[PDB]
Subunit: 417 residues, 3 copies
C-alpha cells in the first residue's frame, strides 16, 4: 500500500503458511513497482516494512532482497531446544507441552552454492551498495538435521545445507537484531560488510552461527547469545578491519568461539566464552593489531551423553587462545581450564592456554589462568620458535611460560613461596 | 487469529479497571486455538499482546504458562515517584504530571508467598522448560510504598510486597528488554534461568531490582539503568554459572550494586557502579573463578535529606569489593572513595577498598584507588587491599603501595605499585 | 483515543510536505485529551507516534513538551550521502538510489540559536523534569551541506545549521535508540541529561554527532556506530558525572572520538575508535577520576581524495589520548599509530600517544603501543580506500613517545605502557616502570 507497511498474513492471494517465501517476494515486487523513481521531491525509494505476526510459516521459495531500506520484522525470537527434544525418546513426546520452535517462525523448507539453501538472500551489485536492510525479532528454523555419514544420530549432525540469512553483496549499515535462529547449518552469513551491527540475537543449535566473509570494516557483533556445532564457527570473520566483538555470551559447541582469518585492528573484548574443546579463540593468517581483553574463557568437558565422544579434532596443545600474527594485545583475560587427566590429548601432554605460533610484537599481560583436574599443571603461554619479539607479563609463573628468553621479554607472575 | 492482540481491542473485560483479567482471557484464547503440538511441523507458535500507551490497573495476577508469548508496549514511562512523594503535597497541583506513564501497568494487588504479589507470574512445570517469553517496552508501577513497622515516611520504605515480573519455573531463552519498573518492592525476580537476557531496561526506585534465584547458566544482564533501595539488591544472582554482567549503569541506593552467592565462572565487567554505602560488589558463599574487570566504582555520601541518615548497616572496613571464594580475577578497576573522615565507622578506622575475607588463588592486579576526605577535597589514607588471614595464596599486583596492601607476605604474592622516584 | 497515532492516518495536513505540522497537531490532540494529572492514579500517560517508511519533509519544528512521548519508525534508513555527493552529478541518474530512506524525516528548516534549526525540540520548564521521551528506529536527514567559505566543496563542509534532536531542558530517563542520522550539522544535542540512554544508533556524516551539554549524571552512550566531521565532535560531554561510554564503534572523521570537559567519575571503556587526526580522546578542564580502559585506538591518514588535505588543526605532539585532570585511570588500551613519517607535523617530531598535560595522580598501566611508518596513498573510491588501509599492516617501525608527562602534571604512575625511551617524564616526581624489553 501507499504507506509501505505490509503484513504477510494480509497479502492478497498469498498463503504464508504454505509458502511465505513466495508471499515476501510478491511484496518486494509490489514495493519496486511503486518505488520506481530515485529523485522526486528529494526522495522516492524509502523502502518498506514487512511484518510477520507470530505463527508457523513454511518457506519453500528463497526470498531475494535487492532493495535498500527493507525491514523484515516479527514478534518473537521463538527459540526452543530442538536438540533436547530430538534426543528425548519419541514415545515421551506426547506429554511435552510443546515440541517445535515458535514466535514469528519461518520454517526453511528448501533443498541444500550454499547461497541457494538460504531462506533470505540479499544480493544487488552496482552502486551505491545496498544499505540499511534490517532483520528484527523473528525466528528462522531449519527444522531437522540429516544423516551425513558421520555415524551420529541424524538430528545431532548439524548438517542440512540450509542458511537463515545470506548476504552476497557489498553492504552498508545493515542490522540483524533480536532474532532467533535454530537448526540451520549456517545461521547468518554476510559477505563484504561495512558498518554492520549484529546485536542481541539468539543464535543456537546451528552448525555455524555468525560468518563475516570476503572482507569488511567498522562492524560490530554485540550482546548475542551464541551456540554452534563442532564442525562450525560461533563467530567467524575474515579480512575485517575495525571489528568490535563484545558482550556476547558464547556457549558450546562450536569448533571455536571466535575465529579470525586476516582480521586486523579489531577488538574481541568483554565476552563470556564457554567451550568443550580447545581452540576457543583463533587469530590466524596474519591477524594483527587486535585487542583481546577482559574475556572470561571456560574450557571444560561435554556433560551430555549424545555428544560424548564428539569434538572439534584439536588436541590440548592447540591453546584456548591461539595467535598467528603481529602486534596483538592480550590483556586482562580470565582462563578456567577444567579437564580430566584421562581426556587430555595427546596422552600425557600438558594443556596450553595461550599459544603464539607465529608473528612478532604481541603484548600479553595480566592474564589469570586457573586449571583444575576434576590443580592441574598447564602451560599458560607457549611461544613457538616461529614467533618472536613478544612481551609476556604477569600471565604465568616462570614454569608456566614456555618461550625463548633471548628473543622475548618475559616477566613471570610473582609466586607465593 | 493471526496471534496478535491489543488489550484495548479485546472484547472481554476492561484494561483500565483490570488488565490482569484481560491478559488472562487472551492467554485462554491462545491456548484454546493452539491445542495441538505437532501439526504441519508446528502448532503452538505463541502470540503477541500489545499495550498501547495508557493507565491500566491490574487487580488479577497474570499467569503466563505458554512458550513464545511476547508482551509489548510503547513506553517505559519512568518518572521519579520518589521525588514527587517527597515534594510537599500542596505543591502537587502545580506539577506538570505526578505519575509514571507510557504503557503503564499499575499493580493493584495486595501484598504476598512472594510470588502472589507479582503482576506477572511465569510458571509451568513439566517439560520442556517454558521458553522464549519476551517482555518489551512497557511500564510496571507499584504506585506507593507503605509502612513497614519501622518507620520512616511510608513512601520512602521501599516496602509494598509487590513484584513486577516473577518467573518461578525453569526457563530458557527469556528476554526482558526496554522496560520501565518503578515503586515495586521487587522489580524482576527470575528463578532457574538458562540463556536469559535482561537488556536495556530502566529499573529504579524499586526495593530490589534484578534477582536471579535458585540457579542458572549462560545468562546476561546488559546495558541497564538500575537503582534499588537500602535493604535490597540492585543486581543479585545465586548459583549461576557463566553469567555476564556488563555495561550497566547502577546508581544508588541498593544495599549493594552486584551481589553474588555461589556464582562461578562469571563476569562482572565494564559497569559503572555508584553507591552511598560500603559493600558495593559482594562475592559470597564460594563465588569462584569470576572476572571482575574494568568497572568504575564510586562510593560517596547520600546528599538528599529524606535518606541522609539511612544506610545498609555496613561499616567502612567492609570494602567496596568483598570476596569470599577461590580463583577470582580482579583486574583494571577504578575505585573512587569519597567520605567524611569524621564519619568513618568504626571511629579511627582506615577505610578498606578490596577485601578478601576467604578463599585462595585470587588474582588482583592493576587496580587504581583514589580516596578523598569531603564534608557530608584532601587525599585520604586507605587500605587498597585487605587480605584476611582466612584467605591465602592470593596474588596482589599494582593495586596499592605496601602500606595500602594489608596482607601476610609469607603466604601471598604481593607486588606493591612502584613508588615515585628512583 | 488509545494514544497511538500514525502520521499517514491523520485528517489534516500532509506528512510528505510538512510532517512537523502533522506531529505538532498530534501533540496538541494528546494534550487536549490528557489535561488532568491525577484521575484514578493516572491521567497523562503520553502517547506513541508512528512513522511508516516514507519520505517526509519537515518545514515546522516539532516541539515536544510532554513526558512519555514515543516517536518511532520502521527504518534507520542510512545511505552515504557523502559518497553520493562526491560522485559526478551527471552519473546520479544511473545509481540504484540517491537518498536515505526508512522512516525518513527531511529537515527543511533554515539555519538557526542552533535550537531553532532542530527538527525536534524537546523543552519544558518547571517541575518535574520532562521524563521518558523515546525516539526509536527512524531516520533524520539534513539533506545538504552548504558553502561556508572554508574552500571545500559545499557538500563536504559539514555545515547547514540543522539539528536532528535538540533537548533544551533538564530531562530524566530519555532514550534514543535504533535511529539513523545523516547530513546534519548536529545530530543529537541533549542538555542537562539525567539517566539518559543513547543506544544502538547509526549517527554518521554529521558535523557533530552526540553532544551532552550543560551538565548531567548517570547516563550511557552504548553500542552506537558514529562518524562525525573534522570541525565537530563524535561523542562530547561537559560537566557530566557517572557517564558510561562503551561498546561504540567510532569511525572518522570527527575532530575527536570522545571529548570531555569537566567530566568526572565516568568510564570510557571497550570502544573501537578510529581517527584520521590526533586528539582522539580528550579529557579537558578538570576531567578527573575517569576510567579509560580496554579501548582499541587507531590513528592513520585520510585515504579518500575529497578529504585528503583536510584535518582538525592539531599536530602529532597532541597525543591520541590527552589528559588534563586528576586521578584518572588509563588501563589496558591498544594504540595503533599508522602514519607516513614524511607527513608528521611538525617536521621531524616524534608523535605522542598518551599525553598528560596537567593534573596529579593519574594511573596509566598496561597499554600496548604499535607504531608503523606506512604510506597510505589515497584513492577517489571511498570504501575501497577505507578497507585497504585498515588491512594494510605492511611496514617498518616508527619511533613514538608512548607517554609524555608535561611538567604541569606530576605524581602520576606509569606502568608497562612503553620502554624508558618511549616514556618522556620526570622520574623524580612520577612512579615509572618501563615495559620490559629484550
Ligand atoms: O552445551 C551447550 C549446547 O548444548 C545444547 C543442546 O544441544 O544445550 C544444552 C544446555 O545444557 C547444558 O548446560 C547445562 C548447564 O546449565 C547442563 O545442566 C547440561 O548438562 C548441559 O548439557 O546448555 C545450555 C547452557 O549452556 C542449557 O540451557 C541447555 O539445556 C545447545 O542448546 C547448546 O548449543
Ligand atoms: O541517589 C539515587 C536514587 O535517588 C533517587 C530518588 O530517590 O534519584 C535521585 C537522583 O538525584 C541525585 O543525583 C542528582 C544528580 O547528580 C543530584 O542533583 C541529587 O542531589 C541526588 O539526590 O539520582 C539520579 C542520578 O543518580 C537523578 O536523576 C535523581 O534526581 C532515585 O531515583 C535513585 O534510585
Amino acid at each position: 500500500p501507499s504507506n509501505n507497511r505490509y503484513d504477510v498474513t494480509e497479502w492478497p492471494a498469498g498463503n504464508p503458511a504454505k509458502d511465505i517465501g513466495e508471499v515476501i517476494n510478491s511484496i518486494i515486487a509490489d514495493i519496486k513497482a511503486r518505488q520506481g523513481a530515485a529523485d522526486v521531491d528529494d526522495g522516492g525509494k524509502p523502502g518498506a516494512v514487512i511484518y510477520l505476526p507470530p505463527g508457523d510459516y513454511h518457506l519453500r521459495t528463497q526470498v531475494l532482497i535487492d532493495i535498500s531500506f527493507l525491514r523484515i520484522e516479527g514478534s518473537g525470537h521463538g527459540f526452543t531446544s530442538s536438540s533436547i527434544r530430538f534426543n528425548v525418546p519419541e514415545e515421551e513426546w506426547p506429554d511435552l507441552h510443546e515440541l517445535w520452535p515458535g514466535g514469528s517462525r519461518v520454517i526453511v523448507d528448501l533443498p541444500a552454492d550454499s547461497a541457494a539453501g538460504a531462506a533470505f538472500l540479499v544480493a544487488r551489485e552496482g552502486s551505491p551498495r545496498i544499505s540499511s536492510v534490517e532483520f528484527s525479532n523473528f525466528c528462522i528454523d531449519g527444522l531437522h538435521f540429516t544423516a551425513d555419514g558421520s555415524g551420529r544420530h541424524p538430528e545431532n549432525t548439524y548438517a542440512n545445507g540450509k542458511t537463515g540469512i545470506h548476504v552476497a553483496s557489498a553492504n552498508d549499515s545493515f542490522r540483524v537484531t533480536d532474532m532467533g535462529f535454530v537448526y540451520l547449518e549456517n545461521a547468518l552469513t554476510i559477505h563484504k560488510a561495512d558498518a554492520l551491527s549484529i546485536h542481541h540475537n539468539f543464535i543456537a543449535e546451528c552448525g555455524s552461527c555468525i560468518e563475516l566473509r570476503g572482507w569488511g570494516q567498522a562492524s560490530k557483533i554485540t550482546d548475542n547469545l551464541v551456540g554452534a556445532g563442532p564442525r562450525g564457527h560461533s563467530i567467524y570473520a575474515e579480512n575485517h578491519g575495525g571489528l568490535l566483538v563484545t558482550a556476547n555470551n558464547v556457549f558450546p559447541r562450536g569448533a571455536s568461539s571466535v575465529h579470525f582469518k586476516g582480521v586486523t585492528r579489531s577488538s574481541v573484548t568483554n565476552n563470556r566464552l564457554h567451550a568443550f574443546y580447545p581452540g576457543m579463540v583463533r587469530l590466524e593468517e596474519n591477524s594483527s593489531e587486535n585487542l583481546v581483553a577482559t574475556n572470561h574463557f571456560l574450557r571444560d568437558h561435554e556433560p551430555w551423553t549424545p555428544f560424548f565422544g564428539v569434538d572439534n579434532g584439536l588436541d590440548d596443545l592447540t591453546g584456548l587462545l591461539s595467535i598467528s600474527g603481529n602486534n596483538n594485545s592480550v590483556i586482562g583475560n580470565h582462563f578456567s581450564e577444567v579437564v580430566d587427566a584421562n581426556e587430555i590429548r595427546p596422552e600425557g601432554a600438558t594443556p596450553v592456554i595461550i599459544r603464539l605460533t607465529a608473528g612478532t610484537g604481541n603484548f600479553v599481560s595480566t592474564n589469570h589462568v586457573v586449571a583444575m583436574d576434576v590443580d592441574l599443571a598447564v602451560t599458560a603461554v607457549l611461544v613457538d620458535p616461529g614467533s618472536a619479539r613478544n612481551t609476556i607479563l604477569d600471565s604465568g609463573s616462570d614454569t608456566q611460560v614456555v618461550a625463548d628468553r633471548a628473543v622475548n621479554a618475559i616477566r613471570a607472575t610473582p609466586t607465593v613461596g
